[model samples]
Target: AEINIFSVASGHLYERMLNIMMASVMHHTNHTVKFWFIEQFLSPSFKDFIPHMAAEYGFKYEMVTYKWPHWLRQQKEKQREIWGYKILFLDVLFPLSLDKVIFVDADQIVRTDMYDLVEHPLDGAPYGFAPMCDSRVEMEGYRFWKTGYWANYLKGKPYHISALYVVDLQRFRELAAGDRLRQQYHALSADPNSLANLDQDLPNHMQFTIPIATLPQEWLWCETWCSDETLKDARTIDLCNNPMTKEPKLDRARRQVPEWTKYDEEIAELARRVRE
Candidate 1:
């Protein structure tokens, strides 16, 4: 089956990362790859550039948009609103024909054929997420989810990362996971202090009811969470920002992944071509 991936991005920085992320997907997979992007947040230039890139790369893409439903609670900040889009409307975002889609964060690099993720059994769950890595012992201090309210709530369940996930659209819609999420979101978002990590927290918080299939740990590895020893086995790498150092993404992208510079340069060349 063809691989379908959904994601949202805005601004020049994320657009840049999105291009590289697309290129990385094209590089790894031989199967047909179709990308579904949220049309609302994309920049005007990206809107123009994507068609040319699609033609050149021979991958399929469609831009999708949805107005925020009036009944749901609203978010003020643009980034928070984007986060809301990431997890809130999974069932409605794509066409009904699309049975499954992997949500690849705009800033991530895929090293394996993501069709594997699409084909991976969900074990009757509506979606799957990679559990956050606890291997980087030094960063344990920053793992707020592992302590306090989350610890008590999760019990022994794993706290999943939102950067990369696979959603079984059929199950998601049939089970009404989106409605369940919106109902929970309405209650929590009103508190103003809750859901600090909107996309990640919402699903993890709702795990008791919605039940997330935990993808393999190697499926997603981040410098902030996973130690260097396990880096070689990583199928995907997320440029998950570290609050401690506040290092810029571009710098980390170039330094951490040796293959990133080539992809960056390649996308830059494509962008230059689109300019003419």
Candidate 2:
């Protein structure tokens, strides 16, 4: 069965990362995938050749453009990634002709077949996301717990990481999920401290209000949180890893002493220089 996946690239760096991820997904899985990308704007000369890559890999490519919303303007970029607000519009922008779609972060490596993950039953839930691995509990601290800032309905819920997830567009359309989020986004625009993870806070806030599906962390494993064994079993590795050294962590053998297999070295090389 064909699968539809959506993702976004916020800058030139991420544009490179997105291209690599597209090719890598084709390399690992024989199952066909359609990658839909959102580029805020594009200038040629600086243009991209995504269609060529898709042709080489046997997948389909479609691009969508969106303007940065004025309502969500306070994204001071010292550390916070600006484009985190993009997915907030998924339900609003996603075509109603398709029933579901996978949203993945630009910085990830697809290592396993996703037919199972994509086809996994949602049981009538609006969404399903990779829950944060235990290690992320600390990194994503204030967002997941009750600190008196969240609505009582959201207190003490296990917040899902924003990286990768499957969204049921049909349900979202029926329930007007986009309309619900617009209110939350507008409210947050008035106060900065209202959220710890910005757009990510909305779904968790809906914890009691909506029945959301969740997957094991391995579906979108994080190198910082998951063990080597777990990473091996992971379908895709989230490479936002804080590397212990110059060698990238997602390569999995960067810290080896006598070094390791060429396979591992090759993987590290892929990550060490993942600029498109």
Candidate 3:
């Protein structure tokens, strides 16, 4: 069986993503897995060794380059560049020929065998994405909830929301069919000022209209709004925020200490595996 994992290369987060991917492949399966590091730039030193490292642990490495104009624009709006670069992963679906692919965010770690995720039926669906909501109030007001483009298409329907996705390349290509979906989504926001963050939202909007399979929440556990109740059965944990902090420190102004210790042991175990 062929399983390919896709992620963009950028920032300190890439290091952790690489480590988690290596460890997950090493610890979980013997199948042939390919890691496609899609980016405009990657350290040459790191690039040279990734193939050998993958071979040593029984995986494959491939690099895909996509044009990133923002990198050359200017540094004043670095944050915008960062978010804009994130949308690059969407490019992978365009040129790739894989039957199906799992696109995991750089911040998420796979804790259990991912065979189920890779093999799960999409029920003839072309794409699958996760939607996560924290409370009934938020869920009720989701369509009107304008955290981003989601507000534009909000119809008061319960939907899965997350950046992680499983894509059927053939289906996506058929649906998109020569239209620039990325640019279209970007334009929906209208303000180039907000173009920075539309990458994730664009896909969410596409899924809303295209209707992909919504996998079980356990498949992609989002850490942002996750609770202990949700974590118990989560197969993939997305530590979007810094996962290395010893504990969730309360904001002196807000006076709240989120439970950070819950992840300490897990992070330690994952680190140990990566080092080994």
Candidate 4:
């Protein structure tokens, strides 16, 4: 079976995630790994560097560009809101035939063997996602809820949801072609100016109806704004902030603690290994 993964590229710290993700996968599994970049206003220097870096690491690289103007028009002033939607559209264009795929954010790194993730049973579901810690109060009285549109949409749903997902591509396409996606897209286009956080809320809303498979939280562990206990058994960690500050270390329970210097050494060593 083919194992594939996808990432969306923003300007910040993308190379670090790409390099580490490739190294981790190649180090752990012999299955062919395909790395894709969903280019979103990246610098030319970064764009040129991606292929060169991937070549050194012996990983395949592909650039997936979208009709940015159209996408932006559809998203209005809220470009970031529709970023994930654009990426989901990109996933539909994967070239290879595969039974499954795991879509990861560029902010994450794999620290364990992914064989089990690749072979995880779809169990007849269209996709799998991780559940977010319920914190419904955080959204209370926020501007988004005052409109009554978003609050009603999210009613009876968990307060937060994870973007990390495992999907059955074939079924995903079918759902996308159906009315569900069309209605959401129209809603997004209608209020693009007001759609400040489309990528997160829109997808979460879709999942509420379609209900993708939910995986154990450990499979795609997130680091930022998460509890320490959640990281305890995490095989993959999403370092959404500065690496120097986000590397796993002791005293993580303390706020504003400095990252150990050893993290620099570890990353340098990994870069050196990639050069070899």
Candidate 5:
């Protein structure tokens, strides 16, 4: 079966990360993969480069966009609007003909067959998200969800990561989850501080009402939250910014994953050829 993937990226650096991420996913799986991208933020170079990349890699891709409803509270910055697109318009993002899609962050590296996530059963939930990892004991101090209001709200349940998630489009639409999310977003957007991590927090905050199926922990591994010892079992690695060291995303990618540079160079070569 074919796999349908969704991702978005804005700047040149993130656009570079997206290329590596797509290459890694294609390298791992034999399944025919089709990628869906948000068109608003992609630079003209990336837009022009994708067709050549797709042909060279033997994958398919389509760019999609949804206009933010005028009535909804608006975001001022481009990044915030990108974040809004990540979680807010899941229902209307793709072709209604497609049944399911997996959202992988543009900066992530996939080491597993993504078809597994594509065919994964969501257990009647509208979507599935990987619970944030708590294995890196050193970062326990950074686990803000473990204390105070967040702790009280979660009631012992794991906080989910939005870097990787799967949506059952049928169930999502049937349940009107997008409408529900917008309602919550409308109220929260009024308060600037409410959804600091807009994409991850909104779905997480509504876990009770929307019922997110918790994907296995191995499905996502962020160095920020997971220990080095457990990296062997990581199926997908996300370059989530570490608050402690403040290392750049590209630095972490090159340092932690040896293959990242190879992918980067390969894309660079392809881009060189495409310039002619």
Candidate 6:
């Protein structure tokens, strides 16, 4: 009933990478949180590897079956497969015992306290999440995505980032997130225009009608995708930039490591020992 978490993995490589995320959380906190790995065509070997990993990492772990919902199959096919929209299905796939939970992306490292979500008061909001994001339209010369965050939430409100979110299950259950999203998905799918970032975009756009609490970006940060200055502020350095693609860990691949990541070794190292 407490501290339940969900993460979705599509393949063996990502399943292995998810272990790193599991380790990072263990490295930072020992809050006794249970994790659910909803698998989508993952390697049998990798699925077998989790029990061993749970022992090594010191956290409770379980596997949840992933079903490609009928509504999702009906959507206009895109290059991305299951991992793309699978996040949306968590409200249904996650165990009912976990009526409230935290959804952590498998592509991140936890640097500080991972329990921030537990303490963040939702204030009757249906959701709580971090902010920082993308371009509005691809058809522009120098395009900047518009955020009506100010109009919807606060004039200086932080725009919600898609990487991490804290869900109030009771609120979601009350609103019937599954039925509503499926209906909306059906309605939106009929349009010729595609919804590339459906999981991120719909919840974001819905903040006008749905009250969502905006947590600090330090909670769920994507270093390569976000600005360098925020490095001074991020609690978790989520490696989301190289994550979308199938790149191996940082030491093995030099191309995916952004020039900014290099700054981490120098800036972070000096900052660390300097304090000592």
* Superposed Cα deviation of residue 144, candidate 6 (Å): 4.0
Write model 3 residue lDDT over 1-276, tens digit each, in one string. Answer: 377777765655465345455555456666677777754546665575565566556777667766654423322465554455544335343455676667776655566666667787787666677666453232333233445444546565335554567776677666662145555644554655543345455555555566668788777665444555676687776654323333332221012212223333444564456568
Taken over the whole model, the C-alpha lDDT of each candidate is: 0.92, 0.63, 0.56, 0.55, 0.91, 0.61
Q: What is the lDDT of residue 48 in candidate 6?
A: 66
Q: Could you give candidate 6's per-residue lDDT for residues 180-266 as a string of tens digits?
A: 666666676566564556666666656656667888656765544556566657676556544334445564323423432443343
Residues 1-276, model 4: lDDT tens digits: 355776665544555545555565656666667676665546676576666655654667667665543433354344453364443463345653655667776545565666677767766666776655322334334334435666577675543334466767777665553346545656665664543555555555676666656677677554444556666676666554323354442233123222222333455675566579
Off by over 4 Å in 6: 71-85, 133-143, 147-158, 242-276
Quote each prediction's TM-score: 0.98, 0.77, 0.71, 0.70, 0.98, 0.75
* Number of the candidate with higher lDDT, 3 or 4: 3
Worst 10 residues of 6 by lDDT: 135-144
lDDT (Cα) of model 6: 0.61
lDDT of 1 by residue, 53-156 (tens): 78877798999889999989999999899999999999888889888988999999989999889889989999999999999999999998889999899998
Q: In model 1, where do residues sit more than 4 Å from their true spots?
A: none
Worst 10 residues of 4 by lDDT: 252-261
Error of 3 at 212 (Å): 3.1
* Model 4 spans with C-alpha error above 4 angstroms: 68-73, 76-91, 96-99, 134-162, 177-179, 192-196, 223-225, 240-276
Clash count list over all predictions: 0, 1, 5, 4, 0, 2
Residue lDDT tens for model 2, 128-176: 8777676544444433344455535555456677788888888877777
